Design a binder for this molecule. Structure first.
Ligand code: K
Ligand code: K
Ligand code: K
Ligand code: K
Ligand code: K
Ligand code: K
Ligand code: K
Ligand code: K
Ligand code: K
Ligand code: K
Ligand code: K
Ligand code: K
Ligand code: K
Ligand code: MG
Ligand code: MG
Ligand code: MG
Ligand code: MG
Ligand code: MG
Ligand code: MG
Ligand code: MG
Ligand code: MG
Ligand code: MG
Ligand code: MG
Ligand code: MG
Ligand code: MG
Ligand code: MG
Ligand code: MG
Ligand code: MG
Ligand code: MG
Ligand code: MG
Ligand code: MG
Ligand code: MG
Ligand code: MG
Ligand code: MG
Ligand code: MG
Ligand code: MG
Ligand code: MG
Ligand code: MG
Ligand code: MG
Ligand code: MG
Ligand code: MG
Ligand code: MG
Ligand code: MG
Ligand code: MG
Ligand code: MG
Ligand code: MG
Ligand code: MG
Ligand code: MG
Ligand code: MG
Ligand code: MG
Ligand code: MG
Ligand code: MG
Ligand code: MG
Ligand code: MG
Ligand code: MG
Ligand code: MG
Ligand code: MG
Ligand code: MG
Ligand code: MG
Ligand code: MG
Ligand code: MG
Ligand code: MG
Ligand code: MG
Ligand code: MG
Ligand code: MG
Ligand code: MG
Lengths: 124, 128
RNA sequence: UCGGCAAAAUGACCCCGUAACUUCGGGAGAAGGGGUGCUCUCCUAUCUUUUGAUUAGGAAAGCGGCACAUACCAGGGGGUA
RNA sequence: GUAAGGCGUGGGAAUCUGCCGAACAGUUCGGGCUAAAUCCCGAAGAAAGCUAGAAAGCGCUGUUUGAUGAGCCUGCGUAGUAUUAGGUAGUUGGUUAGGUAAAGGCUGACCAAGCCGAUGAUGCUUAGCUGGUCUUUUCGGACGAUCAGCCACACCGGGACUGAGACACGGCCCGGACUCCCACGGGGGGCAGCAGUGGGGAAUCUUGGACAAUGGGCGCAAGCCUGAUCCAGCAAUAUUGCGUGAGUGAAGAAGGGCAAUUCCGCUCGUAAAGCUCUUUCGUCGAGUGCGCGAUCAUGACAUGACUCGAGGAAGAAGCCCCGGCUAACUCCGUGCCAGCAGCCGCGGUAAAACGGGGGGGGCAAGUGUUCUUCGGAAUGACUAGGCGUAAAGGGCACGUAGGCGGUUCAUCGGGUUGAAAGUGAAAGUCGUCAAAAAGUGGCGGAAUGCUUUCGAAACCACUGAACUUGAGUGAGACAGAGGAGAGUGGAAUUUCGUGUGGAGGGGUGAAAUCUACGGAUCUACGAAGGAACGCCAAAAGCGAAGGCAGCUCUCUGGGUCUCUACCGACGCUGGUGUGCGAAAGCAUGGGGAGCGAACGGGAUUAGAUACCCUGGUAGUCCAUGCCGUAAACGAUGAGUGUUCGCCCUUGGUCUAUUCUGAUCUGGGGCUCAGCUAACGCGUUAAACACUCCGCCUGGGGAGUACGGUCGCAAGACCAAAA
RNA sequence: GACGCAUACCACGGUGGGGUCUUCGACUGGGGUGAAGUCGUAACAAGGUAGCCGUAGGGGAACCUGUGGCUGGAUUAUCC
């Protein structure tokens, strides 16, 4: 535009939608599991991904992924929820944090194990 | 008179890139001839003649093949004498060669002379 | 009670305020509110045929009562098929 | 809470100001509170006395002042939203009274109808503002938490009193909600002070010590207060800090991993252990303390620090990663499962990508993950981008505001510019030194600004006199499907009539419906009617665009050329607005040949709501209104200046030297350059520059939803989000 | 100084409209995505009837048809 046009009507910003609107600009949110289930991935991937329907403390209903192999979650279990989507599964935009609240860590995990709540094995 | 000054400087640039020997400028002004005197002093043009400056003025310019670009500002730009050097740093594309022409209360001067005389004013334009 | 049938209520003038919708005419007195008697004193006018005091309207200060359209007369209103 | 009664910055006049500094004058007499007074009242002139314990020392009062604060006003600067266009009625102004310390519609009365608003009032939403913090080659963006300056508030609303100062966080009165006692009549309370507790939350600390220092209140002091502060406690929350050793060491030990099972087979690995040295940090034991913070004196910190001694490598290394982006590879297990994933992608029997072993890489008392900000992102482009074919030129104009726009001479001093003065708080950023060893300070610079004074006079603005090159007129020549009105012409189609004539015509890929012996098609002449105007004729012409075609006449808009004519910058663009605007469609009345949505029939086909055939309504035409949209396209906004040529052509003029040149004017083809992602554009640019407007910011959702305006409707315009 | 249950102003409270938002709602739409189902074959080649724009009508459904416009279609040694 001309300089006079920019004086009259400036420049707006780019419009981009929020990724995790339900976290409400918090790093984590506590929740309680409503339904623990599995979901199949979008093609070309094929598995049975363990997810959980979680109602958050601000009364938002989200789908969160349960990472790792095996979990102890049931209905009405407390889970701490962090951001981060799962690319196989549309509509799943969050993760459950292992080793906090009801979701236990994974013993026997040895590598990358602070992302799975696993302690350091004591040397004997 | 900013529009006719830019018209004349662009006419000079365009016939310069055609490899011509001379141009005719019309309409002219005293600001235009002072800009051309500064250009002649720095060697960018060879010579210029003013014809009938008080009735219907036209200017003949002699060309040498030495100027890349002459521009007149089309907007008001104030500069202080302590501000001239950083403006010239930001305005010349090479930041080394070329001159900024300023209208001062001491007259129309190039930027180095205006720094030396410690006088500010309005930027007319530049050439390099 | 078949059903507010009948009754009760509203009701006048002046001022404020008036919605949905509309064929832009309406709806509309929508709805909802306030004042109203008398005495004195000013102001205005009554196009005063007894013009230096009489009527109408308005301000302002008072007076009495439960009550000032005191009797008589005199719309109930709104929403929706 | 507050979007301007606030804040930042600079000013002003119509005010007050306890304590503090400095002058001058006074400090007299009665009464009242059970008793008195520096308490209250009265008289003069305003007051108030205490102390010979504080006797010329305090205190008070009045008048002049300095200083410091406070109140009031004001210029400039300081959000989003028009899918919010009108708002105001003490409102805007005047007069006169009142009120205030003080100007003032601050408000009573009277008078006028003003005031604010497209340069965005009012409505709605959000928000304390600043110094500054983080990021960033300058600009910007986000933030306004700590700390300091200003403002606002103190459970929620409303008030005033006292006072120099408050409409007062830990004061008073009233109303409200909540709450604690109550002997039941009634009372009491307000942590958004410091600690602390419930609650909410992913998440944020001790119910600590001392007034030693600094600051503050009271007191003549001595002192007394001070959860201001100072200092300890908790928390890897942050910080370019320090440490976890320094050497040596081959039985290359054991053990682990890999291996034609290569060179001690390769590697963990000189790694460990062992041996020698040093003990920072932390640990333990002592000793001086006018070491130091503090001095006349006073030390919470301080169970510290400092100094000395004991001791023994002793007490101190993880986290992420190793397919590519990206530094770092092998074995086993699994077998599109389990799982991984920032992106691209991995896993379906030899997976460097999943999980474990072994090895390795990066950082390191941290390191990853999530959230949030800036950068990379020139990905909202001022710096520094675009719109022919990728997102994006408004269908086209006219014009309001606004923006932008020729020459000379003279004047002036508002902008501009030079210097001086004032201001720009401190802290922070930058420079430098010293200090310190994860810590501090001084002096500068910067603070790009505003006010005042005095210079300058080129530019912008303003004033005056002039100029003619841009715009506009006139005179004289022209061209034109420019527009509107009124007349008129012929060909052809259809229908009808009359002669002659007799068998089909029409139509298809092939057929059939249809039409024809009531005589068609065909042939001659005639009649009626509507619509469109062949040839000319087209890369021609005209119009702003949409558009405009037979001919005549009337009325009329614009354009071109020439001039030793006038006039004198009157110009360009154009938000909001206004107008014009194919076709289809709508309303009323006409008209209706041909064509033809819908529809009927005949066919094709698996079906055929089509394509083909045959009938054919609205419509297509006229008059008057509405609508306001098109691939309304050159998919190219309007304008101005400049840039090598060649070939044509429209309409003029001049020169001609018998056939052409020159110069304007539009319209085309080609091209040197230059430009372009490429195709291509190229004096009618998409070239070299500029002015002004419109528009774009990944795809889909979507030109959809909602709302407003407009329309008789059909719909149109502005136009999202999940 | 009272003081008057004297006027004014005024909070709370009552009441009627506006402006601007918001909870819930029988039912009825739209959009996005998907393995594979049903019906057809609309577009891309002249895509089998060139395609597309505005507008109008018609149809299970893509779509078809008129009308004006566009080329962002292919094919095809100008002739008084
Ligand atoms: K995972
Ligand atoms: K301040
Ligand atoms: K309050
Ligand atoms: K103290
Ligand atoms: K951490
Ligand atoms: K050690
Ligand atoms: K114009
Ligand atoms: K033309
Ligand atoms: K014209
Ligand atoms: K012509
Ligand atoms: K070409
Ligand atoms: K041009
Ligand atoms: K169509
Ligand atoms: Mg009943
Ligand atoms: Mg009745
Ligand atoms: Mg009755
Ligand atoms: Mg009367
Ligand atoms: Mg606004
Ligand atoms: Mg707030
Ligand atoms: Mg701010
Ligand atoms: Mg509270
Ligand atoms: Mg006091
Ligand atoms: Mg007082
Ligand atoms: Mg308190
Ligand atoms: Mg507290
Ligand atoms: Mg909690
Ligand atoms: Mg002190
Ligand atoms: Mg003292
Ligand atoms: Mg304390
Ligand atoms: Mg460190
Ligand atoms: Mg030590
Ligand atoms: Mg010790
Ligand atoms: Mg000491
Ligand atoms: Mg300590
Ligand atoms: Mg690599
Ligand atoms: Mg394998
Ligand atoms: Mg990897
Ligand atoms: Mg792995
Ligand atoms: Mg940027
Ligand atoms: Mg950058
Ligand atoms: Mg730019
Ligand atoms: Mg771009
Ligand atoms: Mg452009
Ligand atoms: Mg256009
Ligand atoms: Mg367009
Ligand atoms: Mg001059
Ligand atoms: Mg000046
Ligand atoms: Mg400073
Ligand atoms: Mg410092
Ligand atoms: Mg320093
Ligand atoms: Mg039409
Ligand atoms: Mg008709
Ligand atoms: Mg049929
Ligand atoms: Mg047909
Ligand atoms: Mg027909
Ligand atoms: Mg359009
Ligand atoms: Mg067209
Ligand atoms: Mg000619
Ligand atoms: Mg030409
Ligand atoms: Mg381009
Ligand atoms: Mg335009
Ligand atoms: Mg539309
Ligand atoms: Mg609508
Ligand atoms: Mg088709
Ligand atoms: Mg097809
Ligand atoms: Mg096609």
């Amino acid at each position: 535009p001309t300089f006079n046009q920019l004086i009259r009507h400036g420049r707006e910003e780019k419009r981009r939608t929020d990724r995790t609107r339900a976290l409400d600009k918090c790093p984590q949110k506590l929740g309680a599991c409503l339904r623990v289930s599995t979901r199949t991935p979008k093609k070309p991937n094929s598995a049975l991904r363990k997810i959980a329907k979680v109602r958050l403390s601000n009364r938002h209903d989200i789908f969160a992924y349960i990472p790792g192999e095996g979990h102890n979650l049931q209905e009405h279990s407390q889970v701490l929820i962090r951001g981060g989507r799962v690319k196989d599964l549309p509509g799943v935009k969050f993760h459950c944090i292992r080793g906090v609240k009801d979701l236990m860590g994974i013993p026997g995990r040895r590598r990358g194990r602070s992302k799975y709540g696993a302690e350091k094995p004591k040397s004997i | 008179g900013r529009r006719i000054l830019n018209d004349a400087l662009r006419t000079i640039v365009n016939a310069e890139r055609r490899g011509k020997a001379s141009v005719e400028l019309k309409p002219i002004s005293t600001v235009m001839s002072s800009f051309l005197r500064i250009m002649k002093e720095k060697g960018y043009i060879k010579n210029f003649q003013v014809h009938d400056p008080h009735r219907v003025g036209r200017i003949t310019v002699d060309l040498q093949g030495r100027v890349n670009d002459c521009k007149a500002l089309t907007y008001r730009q104030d500069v202080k004498a302590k501000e001239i050097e950083e403006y010239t740093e930001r305005t010349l594309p090479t930041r080394q060669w070329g001159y900024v022409v300023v209208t001062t209360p001491d007259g129309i001067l190039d930027h180095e002379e205006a720094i030396k005389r410690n006088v500010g004013g309005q930027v007319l334009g530049f050439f390099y």
